[PDB]
Design a protein around this ligand. Structure first.
Ligand SMILES: Nc1ncnc2c1ncn2[C@H]1CC[C@@H](COP(=O)(O)OP(=O)(O)OP(=O)(O)O)O1
Ligand code: SF4
Ligand SMILES: [Mg+2]
Lengths: 1140, 261, 258, 259
DNA sequence: CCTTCCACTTCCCAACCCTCACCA
DNA sequence: GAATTGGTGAGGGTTGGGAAGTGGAAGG
């Protein structure tokens, strides 16, 4: 032990030296100071007994640039539960058993929502245990856990212990949850000497934020031609970085052929980008100079793009090669998870934000794409192989590139990441490293632990996964799931506001609407707008124009009209469904618990019962057959963990090994004894939701919804003020206003992200508050709503696309559209309403509205008020100019989730699911699709529309049939190649066949395991003709060989084309033109020709044939010999049914 | 009870193997006069009629008339168990939940028995015009089978024309044209090979071969088939089953729309 | 060195395809007594024994024991190339990792010669014990093959029952039940054509029919088949190969869920 | 006008059943000497050659030489309608777009009469080389078919070795290696089993079994197959049709440069 | 000797299982 | 110590059953 205790003292001292070097001078002296909390860490401090005690160090910054630390000691603790009357005996044994190991133990009443009959007010005494250090907790829990484990399976004083809670919450998070200490707030702190703990208290009065010094850096290295760099071989050429808007550049004259002059780079006037330059003779001087300039400026946040992957490991290794221990000079060290962290500063990585909250496609996670998308400028590019020649031939261009990556990194970090992350830090207990790195379900869990603590709830233990659970009918389940969101593409082809389109309608549906027009408007004003109906003068007029237009429609239900294209969808559907129904992860109950609740009384209104669809998949073997296969393993024996170790019997295996062996045996047995290894089963279930249970979850969701809309409004107000201040030109007021604008915009984004998180968390594996039912009930209620909106629209008009929460439809030109009300109150003098909205909304309000909401009005008397609510409201987007949907190549199928939509200005409004966005799909498809979508806008009739659209699809077939004859040779390699990813290691896939695996092996043969070794390899290939009749996967050839040396190409192609006599080694010979033309034929059919046959126009593309089934149907339509039915030629005698 | 025994199970096997493709479920009407089945395909273009007479069975009992529904593919499955030489017995009763079958070899070396599950059906009933037909032709069934297969390779629709000199089948498609022709047998080598045409007046009609393909599966029942045709009404093909009965398919023609105009 | 010659060369072809699909790979044991083989179903529910005799070969040299691993697909793809009338020679060595097969045409105008790789297997074995089978049946092979095929259309499990005077096969499923009865006869024409059942006490047992549909692949080895049964004991199917050997399949009876 | 009557109507079926795998669309030519077709296969690996002399038909009229572009899958499907006993007759007119095929039942019981649409084609062709080969081998066709199927089972490609006393085939691949030898017959009792070899100089050569395994589709066409082989020149595989004609495949030897 | 039935092999199409990336 | 959900398209490979053709032996 003592060696470890001294090692802990050593590291505590070293870290205190390291952060002292960066000016985080520890507070040790009487006085009072104030500052902004930027970071925290857990550490032990030496006390007056010269003992280590566990503590937390808080790091503050001040407006003058000064900084300090405070060390706050707090005892870690957790709870144990015991049987009736055990507490004094168990506590006395806990103390004597571990005397001197535990600091304090005490009896604490807490409320657990899982207790029976708890709504009356019943709560139970847990025992708290607390320790001088977490190491004694980690020891003692391992002395308790076997006893509670055995009693949990079955059900000395350890046997009297029944359960243990909260033992795995992180200690620092346990402190920020408890002391309400939170990051990005101004604090006043009072130091009283070690005679008292240091006291921290927030000031709400100040809202301005300081500017903590942020350093962003990027590097460029030499590498071997056509291959990856590695730190043993290569050297850094340049490092470029910015501190707080000032740029700096270092260049190594071992490699860079000339000294670099200082220069200025500005993509757009907002990005200042002045760069100062230091020339160094040696790599060791480049490193030393950078370490010196970092030790001078002493930054508090350090940023780079994806730094844990390359930029830190390379500069670390090249520093250590010269003996510069960067862990000593800078302080940055690789943590256990392989991520660089430091005591004195925070490592923020932009890509861990882009990958999590930017909503960019994976197509554009490359820095130059994410910069081009969010910053609105195109950065500068180099071929990654040329950098080593450019560093000799034209150094200025390499410097310009490496500076441009620094500028883009710094501004991308400042504008998008920094407001967001510190705003989210204001509401979560976690450090800015953990908040950025962790997954959103964890953020939501910490937030719920904050709220559960404030409610004085005791947390549940994390859910533990069961293996191979049994269906009641006896089959072992492979999987369980709930049925998700409904989808159907109802229509296909082209819709436009400018072409005649044919409608047929049900006049009884018009009569039904016209009968209720008054109710639809009276509701749509009072509930949705919240304007009393008395306050408006023209209400009786507008109803007559609505009724008369509906009557004029009713008189002629079938007509040709121009369409109105509308999108009709629900705002924040799933949160609103939760708030409306009062769903909570703990509120699901069964008859067995409602049997105990004293509120279970005749006519008790609180049991709400809702339907969801369970789904399972299971293996067809029976209960006894599986049990026999389990017995058959009683004689099996298995390898050790290491080649010389003892062989293990089946009962000596881990339960994860056991389950995998059993699944292998049963999967082989079922494949022998039956053709089919699995069966799907679907089952309607009804679940009872308690309506009185503690609301802390639902009230949390409510609070985040409301505060989101409050900050959205304040952002609108301040953005107006900002526009006015800019037009007037008051630069100090402009700065004040812009600061408030960015503060509210980041706060509202952070609340939107947190609100989105609450649904999926309840399904996360091992979440504390976990239940599958609440996610099913939400998905099914969101499938009902959208289905009934489809049904109601399908009589009036033609719904086109339907997904989880919104419908795309066309409506007749004569429809009501929007109306205006004039208000007597000047506070809201005019109001507008949209009829399709109120029409759908009243349908929602009639069926879905809850009438069982209950709220505890008097905590002393257990009296609950009973209330109704609906929070679900539709809203309208559009009307749009044009809409286009593709059609399936197979007969009668319809392609879901694919469409394009345009604004009235002809700017592309939406374009969804198409290969133009996807990462990897063939570039020829991207360009073809993009150009045809634009081409559809042209023309005025379906004949002219397709006459336009045809030529853009003809152009690419003309090029391919011409073998791109005139196209430059460098163009084909970008036009013709995929860039597909490979997510796993090449060994981990197993024995599978695929084109990416094939071409990775085809690289391994050519440059060795050095190139495959890392995960995430990118594979660029073309598919080749010469191995005639060889299956597709075997004809995939890397692009790299067309860059490799001639004598290597003329060898490896001769090997891979299985053609030793081959004289011609040119892509234009090698290309399988009839594969790529079949790919384009597969695309062009789905958009331009098959939809055409579905819209009564002849084939617009002569070169492409229809599918055979469609040619049969179109040939059968048109001949003159019509098929009669037998029932029309022979007399029908009657109808009969046969039954026993 | 209903009880029947058949001199050779190959007949009922060949019947079920001919019904299996065209009508998936059907009901049988049973009486002391015999067994009747009539049903209509899932597209109402063609109609099947089957009649087995009381006398053809080796022994027959029918205490009361019965009607029962049968999923024909499952019966064809069970009847795949019986050997070609086997003797087969059917038994049923008015509780009508199940049909019992017994199959045995002529030497009683082995016994096989089964209980087919019956099913519930609803179906519409049609009448028949019972006219005389302006042309009738009697044909070797193997020749009509080959005519259908070969011309079906040329195209999806057949034209049938009957004229004093000889019957003609014609078809055409994207490949070109095909014509197949038969004539009056002047000297009969054997009657089973003879073709005979008798007519009131010549006839021309057109039909979908996708259905005839399903009728010609009757060819292994009997060596000769009857074709009957008349203007603007269904074509008849008819196969006779020994002295026991007959199986008939009616096919509604394709008619020229221009008169409809 | 091991070397052997077989004039009835088609036997090895017929005997191999009866295993090719039931067991993926096997360890053969070679000794002066003859080639012997225990191997187990990949699902380990069922077991194979093959046993030839060295007296039956046209020539047989075995001066030492060998154990050799082979995956039977690899032999099968070679024996496909032998004509049924041709004479087979096998050659192996104690240090070698390959096997040589020579096919000799009776006309002596054609010869063929193949070498295949062994595989490196070892297998842990319990010697299969004798049982005093309470029930034994001898039947013509095609009858049993037809029973197992025709019942396979009804359903995936067969209840086989036996009596002092016959046997019954029965199956129950979604199409309805079906049975086949085979009574014992005293009158018999010939052994290739006749049944002989003997039973000490009544037994009936349930067996997976999709397994028997594998065992029936041995049918062309013999004009008759032997089956034996007892309660709580595996069923054994046995084929005799001239007097050159025998092949047996062992299968456990189904545990009833009731 | 052109017309021809073929009483041996099966041979035209078996020819189309042979060609349809190697070439999908081809142009026939017709002359006073008879019918010719020579064409590269679709992959341009190997060359197919066929001719039928006009002396083979029951009668033949050909007023001018002509060429007819035809789809072999279509003509194969049409000819599958003729019975093997039936007479075939072909006719066309020099300005017609269509070929007329008549099938007559021998007993005159029946007639059938089909037309197929022509298409317009032109194709590149050269005078076929022939010379004295170093090796010639004659064999029962079924034996060569079994040899090809077995070696294609074991291996990718066959190497053929030649001697005065016999001929040997060998292959190797993932399953192992295999060797097959046929010796010259000592004396012949019935001809078709007799293997006979002509041998001027030793030859050993390698060929791709995919194409021999197509070429063997002509096995139903005659009971005796012939092979002609020499160093550094295409293998010729030859089948002789009735009296009237012949079918040849030309396939270049596999190069083994990598050594 | 000629014709029919049964057995075995080959050819062709449909359905299921794998990857990755995008719609909610 | 770690850990959001379900649904769809596109491209590719593997598995199983039915239809068609050929060879033998069996029957008249
Ligand atoms: N990342 C994700 N994780 C889990 N569920 C998700 C999800 N993204 C979408 N869903 C599911 C659950 C929610 C649902 C989308 O419907 P709403 O109306 O609730 O979302 P929205 O359209 O963004 O809100 P609005 O802009 O109208 O305010 O899709
Ligand atoms: S839902 Fe009602 S009856 Fe059930 S536990 Fe809650 S309060 Fe009691
Ligand atoms: Mg929404």
């Amino acid at each position: 032990s003592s060696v470890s205790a001294l090692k802990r003292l050593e590291r505590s001292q070293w870290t205190d030296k390291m952060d002292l070097r960066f000016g985080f001078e520890r507070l040790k002296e009487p006085g009072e100071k104030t500052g902004w909390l930027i970071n925290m860490h857990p550490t032990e401090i030496l006390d007056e007994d010269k003992r280590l005690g566990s503590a937390v160090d808080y790091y503050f910054i001040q407006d003058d640039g000064s900084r300090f630390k405070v060390a706050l000691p707090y005892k870690p603790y957790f709870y144990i539960a015991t049987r009736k009357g055990c507490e004094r005996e168990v506590s006395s044994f806990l103390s004597k058993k571990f005397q001197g190991k535990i600091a304090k133990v005490e009896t604490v009443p807490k409320e657990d929502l899982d207790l029976p009959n708890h709504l009356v007010g019943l709560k139970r005494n847990y025992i708290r245990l607390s320790f001088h250090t977490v190491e004694d907790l980690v020891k003692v829990r391992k002395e308790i856990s076997p006893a509670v484990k055995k009693n949990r399976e079955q059900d000395d004083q350890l046997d009297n212990i029944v359960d243990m809670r909260e033992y795995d919450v992180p200690y620092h998070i346990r402190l920020s949850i408890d002391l309400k200490i939170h990051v990005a707030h101004w604090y006043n702190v009072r130091y009283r000497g070690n005679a008292f703990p240091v006291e921290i208290t927030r000031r709400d009065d100040l809202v301005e934020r300081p500017d903590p010094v942020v350093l962003a850096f990027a590097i460029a290295t030499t590498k071997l031609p056509l291959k990856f760099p590695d730190a043993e071989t290569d050297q850094i050429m340049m490092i470029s970085y910015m501190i707080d808007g000032q740029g700096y550049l270092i260049t190594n004259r071992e490699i860079v052929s000339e000294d670099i002059e200082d220069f200025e780079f500005t993509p757009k006037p907002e990005y200042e980008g002045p760069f100062c330059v230091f020339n160094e003779p040696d790599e060791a001087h480049l490193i030393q100079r950078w370490f010196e300039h970092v030790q001078e400026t002493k930054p508090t946040i350090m940023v780079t793009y994806n730094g844990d992957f390359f930029d830190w490991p390379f500069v670390e290794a090249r520093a250590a090669v010269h003996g510069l221990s960067m862990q000593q000079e800078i302080g940055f060290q690789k943590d256990s998870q392989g991520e660089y962290k430091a005591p004195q500063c925070i490592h923020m990585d932009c890509l861990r934000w882009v990958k999590r909250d930017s909503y960019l496609p994976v197509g554009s996670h490359n820095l130059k794409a994410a910069a081009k998308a969010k910053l609105g400028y195109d950065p500068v590019e180099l071929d990654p192989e040329d950098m080593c020649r450019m560093a000799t031939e034209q150094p200025q261009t390499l410097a310009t590139y490496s500076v441009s990556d620094a500028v883009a990194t710094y501004y991308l970090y400042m504008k998008y990441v920094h407001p967001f992350i510190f705003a989210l830090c204001t509401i979560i207990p976690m450090e800015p490293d953990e908040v950025l790195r962790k997954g959103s379900g964890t953020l939501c869990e910490a937030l719920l632990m904050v709220q559960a603590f404030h409610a004085n709830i005791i947390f549940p233990n994390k859910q533990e996964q069961e293996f191979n659970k049994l269906t009641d009918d006896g089959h072992v389940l492979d999987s369980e799931t709930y049925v998700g969101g409904h989808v159907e593409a109802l229509e296909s082809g082209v819709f436009r506001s400018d072409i005649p389109c044919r409608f047929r309608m049900n006049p009884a549906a018009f009569d039904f609407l016209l009968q209720r027009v008054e109710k639809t408007l009276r509701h749509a004003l009072e509930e949705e707008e919240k304007v009393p109906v008395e306050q408006v003068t023209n209400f009786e007029e507008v109803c007559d124009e609505i009724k008369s237009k509906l009557a004029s429609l009713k008189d002629v239900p079938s007509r040709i009209e121009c369409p109105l294209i509308y999108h009709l969808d629900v705002g924040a559907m799933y949160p609103n469904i939760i708030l409306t129904n009062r769903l909570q992860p703990s509120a699901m109950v069964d008859e067995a618990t409602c049997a105990a609740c004293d509120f279970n009384k005749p006519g008790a209104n609180c049991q709400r019962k809702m339907a969801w669809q369970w789904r399972g998949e299971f293996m067809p073997a029976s209960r006894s057959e599986y049990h026999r296969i389990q017995h058959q393993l009683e004689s099996e024996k298995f390898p050790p963990l290491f080649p010389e170790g003892p062989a293990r019997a089946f009962h000596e295996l881990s339960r994860e090994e056991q389950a995998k062996y059993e699944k292998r045996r049963l999967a082989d047995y079922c494949r022998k004894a039956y053709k089919k290894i699995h069966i799907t089963k679907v089952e309607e279930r009804l679940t009872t939701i308690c309506q009185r249970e503690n609301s802390f979850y639902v009230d949390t969701v409510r609070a985040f919804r409301d505060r989101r809309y409050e900050f959205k409004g304040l952002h609108k107000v301040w953005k107006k003020k900002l526009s006015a201040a800019v037009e007037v030109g008051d630069a100090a007021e402009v700065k004040r206003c812009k600061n408030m604008e960015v503060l509210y915009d980041s706060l509202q984004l952070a609340h939107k992200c947190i609100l989105n998180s609450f649904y999926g968390y309840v399904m996360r594996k091992g979440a504390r508050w976990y239940s599958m039912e609440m996610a099913g009930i939400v998905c099914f209620t969101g499938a009902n709503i959208i289905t009934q909106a489809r049904e109601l629209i399908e009589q009036i008009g033609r719904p086109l696309e339907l997904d989880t929460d919104g419908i795309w439809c066309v409506l007749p030109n004569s429809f009501p559209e929007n109306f205006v009300f004039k208000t007597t109150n000047v506070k809201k003098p005019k109001v507008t309403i949209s009829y399709p909205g109120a029409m759908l909304n009243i349908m929602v309000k009639e069926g879905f509205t809850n009438d069982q909401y209950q709220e505890l009005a008097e905590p002393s008397s257990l009296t609950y008020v009973t209330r109704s609510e609906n929070s679900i409201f539709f809203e309208v987007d559009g009307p749009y100019l044009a809409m286009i949907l593709p059609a399936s190549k197979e007969e009668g199928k319809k392609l879901k989730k694919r469409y394009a939509v345009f604004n009235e200005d002809g700017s592309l409004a939406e374009l969804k699911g198409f290969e133009v966005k996807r990462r990897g799909e063939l570039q020829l498809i991207k360009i073809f699709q993009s150009s045809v979508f634009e081409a559809f806008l042209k023309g005025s009739t379906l004949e002219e529309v397709y006459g336009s659209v045809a030529k853009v699809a003809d152009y690419w077939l003309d090029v391919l049939y011409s073998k791109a004859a005139n196209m430059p040779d460098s163009e084909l390699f970008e036009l013709i190649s995929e860039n597909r990813s490979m997510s796993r290691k090449l060994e981990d896939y197993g024995e599978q066949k695929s084109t990416s695996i094939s071409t990775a092996k085809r690289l391994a043969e050519f440059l060795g395991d050095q190139m495959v070794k890392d995960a995430g390899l990118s594979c660029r290939y073309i598919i080749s003709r010469k191995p005639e009749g060889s299956p597709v996967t075997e004809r995939a050839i890397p692009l790299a060989i067309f860059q490799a040396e001639p004598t290597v190409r003329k060898h490896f192609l001769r090997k891979w084309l299985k053609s030793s006599s081959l004289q011609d080694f040119d892509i234009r010979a090698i290309l399988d033109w009839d594969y790529y033309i079949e790919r384009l034929g597969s695309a062009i059919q789905k958009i331009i020709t098959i939809p055409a046959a579905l819209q009564q126009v002849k084939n617009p593309v002569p070169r492409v044939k229809h599918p055979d089934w469609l040619h049969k149907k179109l040939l059968e339509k048109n001949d003159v010999y019509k098929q009669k039915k037998i029932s029309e030629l022979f007399t029908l005698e009657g109808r009969r049914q046969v039954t026993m | 009870m209903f009880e029947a025994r058949l001199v050779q199970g190959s007949i009922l096997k060949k019947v079920l193997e001919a019904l299996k493709d065209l009508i998936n479920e059907a009901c049988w009407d049973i009486s002391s006069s015999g067994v009747n089945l009539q049903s209509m395909d899932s597209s109402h273009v063609s109609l099947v009629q089957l009649t087995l007479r009381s006398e053809g069975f080796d022994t027959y009992r029918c205490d009361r008339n019965l009607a029962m529904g049968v999923n024909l593919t499952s019966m064809s499955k069970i009847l795949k168990c019986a050997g070609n030489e086997d003797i087969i017995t059917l038994r049923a009763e008015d509780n009508a939940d199940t049909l019992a079958l017994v199959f045995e070899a002529p030497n009683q070396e082995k016994v096989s028995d089964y209980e087919m599950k019956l099913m519930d059906l609803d179906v519409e009933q049609l009448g028949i015009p019972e006219q005389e037909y302006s042309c009738v032709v009697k044909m070797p069934s193997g020749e009509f089978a080959r005519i259908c297969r070969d011309l079906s390779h040329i195209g999806d629709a057949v034209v049938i024309s009957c004229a004093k000199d000889g019957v003609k089948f014609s078809a055409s498609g994207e490949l070109g044209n095909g014509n197949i022709k038969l004539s009056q047998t002047s000297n009969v080598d054997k009657e089973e090979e003879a073709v005979t045409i008798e007519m009131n007046e010549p006839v021309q009609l057109t039909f979908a071969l996708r259905y005839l393909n399903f009728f010609t599966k009757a060819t292994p029942l009997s060596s000769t088939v009857t074709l009957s045709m008349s203007a603007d009404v269904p074509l008849v093909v008819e196969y006779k089953i020994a002295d026991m009965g007959h199986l008939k398919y009616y096919l509604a023609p394709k008619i020229e729309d221009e008169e409809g105009s």
